[PDB]
Amino acid sequence: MKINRQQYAESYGPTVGDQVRLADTDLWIEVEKDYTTYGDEANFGGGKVLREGMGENGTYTRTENVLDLLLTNALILDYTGIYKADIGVKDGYIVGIGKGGNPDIMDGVTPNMIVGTATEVIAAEGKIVTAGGIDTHVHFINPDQVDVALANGITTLFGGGTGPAEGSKATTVTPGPWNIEKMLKSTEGLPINVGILGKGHGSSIAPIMEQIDAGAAGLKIHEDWGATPASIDRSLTVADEADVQVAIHSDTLNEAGFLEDTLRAINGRVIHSFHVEGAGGGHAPDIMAMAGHPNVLPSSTNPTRPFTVNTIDEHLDMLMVCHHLKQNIPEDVAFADSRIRPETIAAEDILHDLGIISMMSTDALAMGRAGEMVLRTWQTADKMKKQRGPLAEEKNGSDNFRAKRYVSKYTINPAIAQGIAHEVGSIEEGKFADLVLWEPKFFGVKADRVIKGGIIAYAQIGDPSASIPTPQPVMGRRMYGTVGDLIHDTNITFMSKSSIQQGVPAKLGLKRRIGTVKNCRNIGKKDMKWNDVTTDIDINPETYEVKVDGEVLTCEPVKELPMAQRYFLF
Amino acid sequence: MKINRQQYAESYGPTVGDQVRLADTDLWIEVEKDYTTYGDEANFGGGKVLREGMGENGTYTRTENVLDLLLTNALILDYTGIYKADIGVKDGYIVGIGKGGNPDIMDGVTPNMIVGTATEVIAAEGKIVTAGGIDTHVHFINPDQVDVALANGITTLFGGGTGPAEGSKATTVTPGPWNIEKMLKSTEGLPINVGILGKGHGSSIAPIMEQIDAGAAGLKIHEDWGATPASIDRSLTVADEADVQVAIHSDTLNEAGFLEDTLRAINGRVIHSFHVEGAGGGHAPDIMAMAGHPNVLPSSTNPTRPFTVNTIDEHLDMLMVCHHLKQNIPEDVAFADSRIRPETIAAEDILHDLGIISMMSTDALAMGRAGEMVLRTWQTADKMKKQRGPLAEEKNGSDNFRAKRYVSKYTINPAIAQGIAHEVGSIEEGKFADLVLWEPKFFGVKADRVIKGGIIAYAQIGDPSASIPTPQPVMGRRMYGTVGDLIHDTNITFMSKSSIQQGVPAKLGLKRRIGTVKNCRNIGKKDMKWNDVTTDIDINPETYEVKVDGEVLTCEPVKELPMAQRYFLF
Amino acid sequence: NYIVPGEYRVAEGEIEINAGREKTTIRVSNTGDRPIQVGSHIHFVEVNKELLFDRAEGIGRRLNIPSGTAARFEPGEEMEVELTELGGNREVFGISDLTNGSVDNKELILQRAKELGYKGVE
Amino acid sequence: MHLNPAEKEKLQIFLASELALKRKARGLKLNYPEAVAIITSFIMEGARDGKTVAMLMEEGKHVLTRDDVMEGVPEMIDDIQAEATFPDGTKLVTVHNPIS
Amino acid sequence: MHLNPAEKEKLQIFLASELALKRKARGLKLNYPEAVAIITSFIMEGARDGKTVAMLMEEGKHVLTRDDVMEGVPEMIDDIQAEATFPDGTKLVTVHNPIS
Amino acid sequence: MHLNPAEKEKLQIFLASELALKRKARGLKLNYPEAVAIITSFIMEGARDGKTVAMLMEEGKHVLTRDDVMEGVPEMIDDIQAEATFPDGTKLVTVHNPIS
Ligand SMILES: [Ag+]
Ligand SMILES: [Ag+]
Ligand SMILES: [Ag+]
Ligand SMILES: [Ag+]
Ligand code: NI
Ligand code: NI
Ligand code: NI
Ligand code: NI
Ligand SMILES: [O]
Ligand SMILES: [O]
């Protein structure tokens, strides 16, 4: 008996060779392989396969290769591949990617993916499943920002702040032992993974290091605290000792140095360059040249992503409002014109497409949008396909190569940069079960369900008084993973090895899962999945034109984007 | 000096012989007796009786027969009676039903109902007071469902789920030790009593029993997991050992047996039959015959309650949406026609009226309405009075007999079925102070105040910025019982004896009151208060007509209900 | 170039289910007065006692239908179905408690079926 | 007023519908949430008028047509579901394929 | 805008009043929450107009009559209370027995 | 509808704008939150219409004049900021000194 490929895809989701459109973009992903055994597909419901003695095993106790949760028939989109599999979760981690069910009667069952008495089922047939997004440029300004992040598929927030204090409103900084302790306690109530950055400023080691020992997961060097040679040098000396990452927003004003001075202070040590294009901050006009260096892990923030007809007008005024600039102070106008540059914003689109900028991030509530990292990644990929054509690496008319290059920018690459990819950032066996289900029609726009540590934390779901959950109004809502003590077991606080060794979690009474930051001094650009290109980036100081391999990088701004007015009420 | 009966009832609430209309129904309850001493009624306010040296005792410390809380002048509606009393609460439990005040100067004071320095006062004059509702068919899908339940007077949720996972969206199941532990922790944050059901599926004892040992309060057998003879048998063997209840949603498809096969597997052991009418699930077409058996504790879910002109059109389409049925697959149309039956829905109204179906429940967010168990109980009673007339048992032109038969369906009977009636389900001395105040005009529609463990958890109250609390907008709001650590002391997590003996609460750090499930293997239909009828129910397999004592049970659907468009904004 | 958000472009061809397993056609009759619907993955010998067929021919087998679908038998209906072989370890536990081990133990399965009145033990 | 949770939520649908209707009146092609909001509010106001579930299942397929909405919106909406208080209590309406 | 909690809540009353007025305009007899919403919003908009508490205590008894509302609604509403910002700050208005 | 947090919040701005416009239509001088609500909703509805950021920066300075608002309101509003979905995605509009 045979099923045509349209009916097969309707029932079980797509299989090998089938393509799926990403929302209302021009981007097509193709199923590369499928772990199923055709006819033994797992499914749940009335008269379906996952029933006792059938696709559900009735013999094995939970410890005996039985799952706590099976996602059936998932279309995985990950740096590791675009492929069809069941996903098995146990003790809050991904334990099996393959074929779930009952070895009693089914062929091809992955041995540790038994559906048993202990197993919950999520139907992923017809869904795209990705890793949770890893946002490494978060300002903690307003707790309302967390649901905004969850609604667009973000599961980890790395950054800093104490709420809407001016220090926090400009910089990803939780400064000093006391502010760090207070925000680790606050974190107990936030339904998302968190890591806190200390102030990467000082001329003595001790004031900087004591933040790492207090429970910071990294440092932020910001020009608003003095992005001087000394603050850069001391921060990186601390980071090399403590095994944590340093993020930098460099000296835009070129007050104590130009870019070459900042690179000399770094002295070949690993650093994460934030908003590397420079509208969000950095050496005017040539900061984006950072992204060519082997020791630099370069991220964009999201408002420049991608280059549109309203970008420049919006950014010139945003910078006026953010910096309190006056239109009748010539030095303010000159500063703004030196910082907001169509030449570097247009080049930023192409550097993303070429794998020269490795990461996306938000700059949430300081100069960026908490719920638009995933959204603007795909809008950029779609613009680049329209303006540059399929990449040479593509086959079968699919955009799989571009889809793996771009999904890496907000999943695995930030995780690697931060020293947390042992826990999060990809759908791989042994990693924490932070998973986002998307309807293809809503892909990258509005998440269906966000799984945190193997329990749903956030869902687009309807009327709580209704007979069924699908009636209006369908909106983003916190789910049982956020409630009571379950918020502790489904979320990770990432901390320095030293703060963990010194017992800070017990001292502060932290109940959340504790994640260890490690292995982020030994990495470089080569470690950025699908985004590992080093090259000489030339930025003309007079014209701001960007050149790579002697070729000017330029593209036009677009009048319209997908993943925009078809979807949003405002 | 004498007071006429109109002024008496306005000042103190009604007294013996006085009748009260239930909302906008045709149902009248009559005060059967009054514990007061006329002239010594308790009341609180300026120049009122509960003042030091007067109706308040100024001598006794709290331990010396003094109450923490007195509800003055309550009209109790309970399986135990419809009568006027003061209700005294201490240490979160009902300690006295009788006459409160000061034995110094008042006649007839119940000895442990002293109003003292330690005593808070709730005025219940002109209110109806009931037990909190016990909903034993809850799907834990969306935490927003809890306020919906509180707003219609529900105080205990028994069921299962992990949030909007497909397993939980179809079945009242929290599967396996890990999911159960995670949801017991979630429960710490839910302002309502909770008991969790495990998966009642397997062919070996150990995978089922380990859920009871992990902290489940019972099991659910659901056809979506395989409602086979084996899963039924193993679940009941576990339940008989563990002293917990089993709920069943039987094999609608008759795949492994017909009703007589399911009854043979049960083998005379006690079981709770969910949605016994069968629109919500079960052997097509004759599941409702379960409700005639002495070992079956039968509940309805609420969307069939009662039979209205929109019921069938609504249910046929609801089942199409719920099951993903296609109108052009003849087997889907045949299935739907075999399951949604006016003959069994009409008979269900009369079986309720006759005391043959013992319980109501919601089926919250799977196939039923979280906030309409109480609402639809009274709409059914009102329809039955209009179509069948006063029951023969009635006296004085009151509906007291019908009111006790119907209030039992959502208070005491589910509590007895679940093994929790030692703690909850009625207004009796020694039970937990879960109490709902109703204005008669809103009775069964919108609760005034919901008391949980002797503290108000939920109230219809107005503008929080106002001089007084009655200005608009008046809406359902969480009260201080829900806030901080008080949510732990005012709510009960119900658990198996074995999980309690094995120290699960301390292992998981549960701070809630722990309730023990017990005495639910030794009971049957005879134990269902006012709803204890066993009889041969015949369901014609060709016509679906229902007969009891040789008589076809049929009634018409109604075009209008009370407790509907007079009250609701949508 | 009309855009349907999230649409599929499925490849050419057909998906063969249960490829390479033996297929068997049998006649089955619902002798009962209520409808019986049978899922794709129930051990076929363990279905409702009132379905009459050669029970031996259901041992070690299930319906050769797409995963998660069912065959429906109206009251009194007789029709042919196609069976495929169980796979994996070819063991069945629970369901109607007729097997509880290898599907190879045909005589033991049929003896229990006959004693419990599963119609068609020949 | 004694608003319960669902009454408080469902006020939002009426508001979104009022916003969408103003956008349609100034000549915009409506987007996905606009279209859903208009048809949902229609159903809830129909229940309040005392229409049957059967009448609203029919009418809901004629509230908006494909020339009222953006490219792809018809194909994004498989169905629209709403629960409202009819004269005979709360019932579920599902409008299947509301826009062609 | 600097909205405080009461300003955010009281927007809901205006909305419920707008919904109720549309239901009255298409010829429905109004129910309990509709009637309360209309009279409440009247009071709050009256305060904003700079009417006195005394004027609104009188006017609120003539916003709706028994032929505007369902059977029993007049007798369900003992009073309607609202606090609003008058030219002389927040004051409480109670309209007693607003519908006969 | 799949409303996200910002969509749910921004419905409130449209509502406050509708309330303020009704107050202006019956001849009231508008106060601070009314004025902000009207100009904010104008910007968000402009984005929905497909105007540019540059057009709304100009137009927003002519929605209300000093004779529409109470004494001191012009000088209380330094600027009005709103983010909305333009055809090219979310952008920030700031209207500087909207009322003189
Ligand atoms: Ag800025
Ligand atoms: Ag700035
Ligand atoms: Ag259903
Ligand atoms: Ag269903
Ligand atoms: Ni920066
Ligand atoms: Ni920043
Ligand atoms: Ni059920
Ligand atoms: Ni259910
Ligand atoms: O930034
Ligand atoms: O159910």
Side-chain angles (χ1 to χ4, degrees), chain A residues 196-409:
Chain A
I196 294 167
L197 304 180
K199 193 189 295 174
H201 297 270
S203 49
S204 295
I205 291 291
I208 303 177
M209 184 57 83
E210 63 178 343
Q211 301 173 114
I212 307 305
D213 294 349
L219 297 170
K220 171 70 171 289
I221 302 158
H222 199 292
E223 74 178 315
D224 284 23
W225 301 116
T228 65
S231 282
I232 295 162
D233 173 59
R234 297 323 182 270
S235 293
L236 285 168
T237 295
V238 164
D240 277 343
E241 173 170 356
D243 200 7
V244 301
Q245 198 50 267
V246 182
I248 185 161
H249 169 145
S250 63
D251 179 355
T252 306
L253 303 188
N254 299 313
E255 174 189 61
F258 291 127
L259 177 57
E260 55 267 22
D261 299 293
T262 290
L263 284 160
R264 187 179 317 104
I266 291 168
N267 194 31
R269 294 174 285 187
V270 192
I271 198 162
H272 184 169
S273 185
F274 275 180
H275 37 67
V276 71
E277 174 284 327
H283 289 285
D286 53 347
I287 179 56
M288 191 161 63
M290 284 289 246
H293 294 264
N295 59 311
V296 171
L297 313 179
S299 58
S300 295
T301 62
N302 72 14
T304 58
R305 313 276 84 245
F307 176 39
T308 82
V309 297
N310 285 306
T311 299
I312 294 299
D313 290 336
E314 163 202 45
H315 277 63
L316 275 169
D317 209 73
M318 183 189 297
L319 179 63
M320 169 179 176
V321 168
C322 175
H323 248 66
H324 296 61
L325 303 182
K326 306 294 283 172
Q327 280 155 328
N328 72 354
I329 297 173
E331 295 89 329
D332 289 357
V333 170
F335 164 71
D337 291 341
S338 80
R339 176 159 165 180
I340 307 302
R341 300 165 301 253
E343 295 81 4
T344 58
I345 294 168
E348 179 190 27
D349 287 351
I350 301 162
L351 295 183
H352 270 291
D353 212 45
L354 290 175
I356 293 168
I357 301 168
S358 300
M359 292 176 288
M360 297 284 194
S361 68
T362 66
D363 217 335
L365 284 170
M367 200 165 181
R369 291 171 177 120
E372 303 195 6
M373 170 172 65
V374 177
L375 184 80
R376 288 166 175 267
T377 300
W378 297 107
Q379 287 168 334
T380 301
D382 174 77
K383 177 182 185 289
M384 293 293 95
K385 179 177 178 188
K386 294 191 304 138
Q387 296 181 330
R388 300 187 73 250
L391 293 171
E393 297 88 326
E394 302 296 4
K395 339 95 250 153
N396 210 326
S398 83
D399 301 301
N400 283 24
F401 184 90
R402 200 175 251 125
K404 294 173 196 165
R405 166 162 288 163
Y406 279 77
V407 80
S408 300
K409 300 174 180 280

Side-chain angles (χ1 to χ4, degrees), chain E residues 59-80:
Chain E
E59 294 182 15
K61 289 182 67 70
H62 302 107
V63 174
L64 294 173
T65 62
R66 82 156 31 247
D67 59 284
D68 296 323
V69 299
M70 292 163 74
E71 173 163 317
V73 174
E75 292 82 11
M76 291 176 73
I77 308 172
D78 296 325
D79 62 52
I80 293 173

